[PDB]
């Protein structure tokens, strides 16, 4: 019913080989609590897993694609909580080569609450200018930053007669008038008939505020999901001591260099991420940053729980395993690298993992690839670490 989005923008995939396997594991069977980003898909890719998606909380990015068409048929409303380049809630860019996307096919797309539309540099995309946008954008937030390119090489979404565009706002905020709490159309005059609640969905009943039930996303849920914190106000949020990367002091720090390693000593729970990069172990000549030493990594031998991701793209060649994390037990996956992964190990050259205490990954996928020395990847009980029917292990380029 409810899934989470992804947070890479125009960046080449971390694994081009398992990109479609990553997507399918995320949007398999309705509401996306984040950004829907579909980039670098091959022309023969099958996207039958996107058929049931209904609403997107953030923005919809479809860029650098080669597919014939993306089947987001039932997509109703993209709320635009987050925006691409802080202006656009829908962004279609460079779909093709200088095949490519053919038609939008967003047949039921009715409301974009906050944000704009950006369509540019599409070699063979059509019907990008015959569809009105002012009838889709919400009245309250009319920041319709529209930048559409009309150049092509080949009042509806597509050529088919089933792609009829139902003008809603132009023909009350919404009508067919709808109830004040109904976002995307309605089939009647009551408050239990519309097909997308504007503010909250209390068991099929659209209301402005949750009955002080628990608010979560845009639905009045009876109890918060597994990996969500419940506050006294009544909200299911992710954040209400040590602080990891991207948390209240290191919001702009990208790696665990030698500058910010002393503050983790003696810690038993990091409220953030843990990113290891090539520049952590070779300090830049610009600043007096001594290269990190394998002996200085022992400050993580007391860690027990990490509230974010554990990303390793560089490791000292003297260390043959991750035994410095033999005490870490749970990765909460509340903050995921690129918005999708909670455990990544790429190009490390380790001979065995050594995460003997890991017993749960609260959210996000797992990438263990390009470790051409690494055995003991299958022997780990991965199904006993996952907690959702959306997590999977993606592994390529490893030791045979």
């Amino acid at each position, epitope marked *: 019913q409810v899934c989470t989005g992804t947070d890479m923008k125009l960046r*080449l995939p971390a694994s081009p*080989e398992t990109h479609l396997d990553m997507q399918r594991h995320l949007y398999q069977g309705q509401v996306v609590q984040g950004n829907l980003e579909l980039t670098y898909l091959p022309t023969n890719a099958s996207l039958s897993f996107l058929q049931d998606i209904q609403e997107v909380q953030g923005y919809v990015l479809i860029a650098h694609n080669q597919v014939r068409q993306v089947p987001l048929q039932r997509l109703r409303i993209v709320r635009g909580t987050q925006l691409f380049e802080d202006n656009y809630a829908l962004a279609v860019l460079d779909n093709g080569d200088p*095949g490519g996307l053919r038609e939008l096919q967003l047949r039921s797309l009715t409301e974009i609450l906050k944000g704009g539309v950006l369509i540019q540099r599409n070699p063979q995309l059509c019907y990008q200018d015959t569809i009105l946008w002012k009838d889709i954008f919400h009245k309250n937030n009319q920041l319709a930053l529209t930048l559409i390119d009309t150049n092509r090489s080949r009042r509806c979404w597509g050529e088919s007669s089933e792609d009829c565009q139902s003008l809603t706002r132009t023909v009350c905020a919404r009508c067919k008038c709808c109830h004040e709490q109904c976002a995307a159309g309605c089939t009647g005059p009551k408050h239990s008939d519309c097909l997308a609640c504007l503010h909250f969905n209390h068991s099929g009943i659209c209301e402005l505020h949750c009955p002080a039930r628990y608010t979560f996303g845009a639905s009045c849920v009876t109890a918060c999901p597994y990996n969500y914190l419940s506050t006294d106000v009544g909200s299911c949020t992710l954040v209400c001591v040590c602080y990891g990367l991207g948390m209240e002091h290191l919001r702009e720090v990208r790696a665990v260099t030698s500058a910010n390693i002393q503050e983790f000593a003696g810690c038993k729970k990091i409220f953030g991420s843990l990113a290891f990069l*090539p520049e952590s*172990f070779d300090g830049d000549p610009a600043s007096n940053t001594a290269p990190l030493q394998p002996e200085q990594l022992q400050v993580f031998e007391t860690l027990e729980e990490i509230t974010g991701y554990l990303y390793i793209s560089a490791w000292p060649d003297s260390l043959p395993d991750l035994s410095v994390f033999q005490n870490l037990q749970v990765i909460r996956g509340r903050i995921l690298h690129n918005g999708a992964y909670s455990l990544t190990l790429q190009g490390l050259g380790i001979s065995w993992l050594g995460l003997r205490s890991l017993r749960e990954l609260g959210s996000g996928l797992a990438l263990i690839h390009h470790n051409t020395h690494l055995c003991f990847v299958h022997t780990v009980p991965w199904d006993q670490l996952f907690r959702n029917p959306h997590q999977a292990l993606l592994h390529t380029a490893n030791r045979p």
Partner: nanobody
Amino acid sequence: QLVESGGGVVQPGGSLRLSCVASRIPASIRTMAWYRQTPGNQRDWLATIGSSGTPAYADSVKGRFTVSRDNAKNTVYLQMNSLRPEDTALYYCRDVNGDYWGQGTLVTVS
């Protein structure tokens, strides 16, 4: 910043050897992987080579292609053998420890 060199036109049954020279000299020789993008498809993995030197080849090209490196010049080669008309595509080298990508060198077999 990675630049490859060694592609071009070749006869079927021939051989080729690409290179991938790093513009900067890293402190550690890192890990570089070889890909191949047939037009319209995702760039398929070919081979990977680590800092130590242990390689890993895909199933399709294992036994024909050979990957190696020279730490003196920080260049990684991809020695191709018994080339075949189906092998024509764009060949790119990526730096796995950093996610830096090359620009590609088109290899044509005819």
